[PDB]
Design a protein around this ligand. Sequence first.
Ligand SMILES: C#Cc1cc(/C=C2\SC(=S)NC2=O)ccc1OC
Length: 343
Amino acid sequence: KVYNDGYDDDNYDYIVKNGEKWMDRYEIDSLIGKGSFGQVVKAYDRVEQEWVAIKIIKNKKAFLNQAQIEVRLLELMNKHDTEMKYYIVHLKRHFMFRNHLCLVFEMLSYNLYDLLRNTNFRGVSLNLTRKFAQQMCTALLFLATPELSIIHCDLKPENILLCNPKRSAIKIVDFGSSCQLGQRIYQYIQSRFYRSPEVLLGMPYDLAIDMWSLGCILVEMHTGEPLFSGANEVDQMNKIVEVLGIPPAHILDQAPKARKFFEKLPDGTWNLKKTEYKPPGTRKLHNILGVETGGPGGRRAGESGHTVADYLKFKDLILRMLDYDPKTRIQPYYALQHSFFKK
Ligand SMILES: C#Cc1cc(/C=C2\SC(=S)NC2=O)ccc1OC
């Protein structure tokens, strides 16, 4: 059995060969990414005389249609004049090659997960996470443009990449799972660790879910570990409840999946269901961040920009991004006016 005249494997993925030359232009070096969508290769563009990342979408109608949505979103974002658009991965061009849709992006550096791994999961300076926080807040403000109204829908350290390994400039990549504001067509969305309470409770979701994701990411970038590392959605909700407490009754009364996690007592109030965790809201973020104990594991004791005053500004902003209420959860514009960013 051969697939696509021997160009494709059995999983519809194009068989990447180091040194192969496409259309007398792109020279493939190596595979730099993989997923259900297909693969990503480092290639040299002979025309522009620069390195590019080519996202080879696997030869399947389902995966091609998903990529077409991604291309439309990227091209729509590219059209906007604002210089906030330079916090989003730039799609240079897209073409069909041997029955594969190929998205040519600008070549970037390491993602923030590789960064966390370089630290052995002890996290980066509060000064660096502030630089990341402000760029991310600007990127989410850009996606918040009414004409775009884009929900990234899969924000995580892996999907945030450095432009340059010796600069702190970041770009959000992978809009392959993205939607624009609209009917709640999907419900199992976002990576588990960065999944908003809305999605967990199966309630309608807006652009605020990306802000929840950001809150979870920035704490992780400082401490080194995911704030909420759930083995399942029930474990996920319980780990959120440990830090933030029981979500307000007004939210859970409207929540279709409320009773997956909580039981409604005869007095109208909500408790957890038992099956292991701290009492609700007793794993204070004050302690996780180490506000008064020299930061995470006391590893930032005596470091410049790691004062109690600096940590309190950070904690205030993170608690505003992790507001259970998506309608009062802090929006990108207001997050950018926060004292955490005031020099
Ligand atoms: C490694 C890498 C890598 C990935 C991208 C972009 C992607 S990957 C994806 S899936 N969706 C995108 O938009 C862009 C540049 C890169 O070079 C480090």
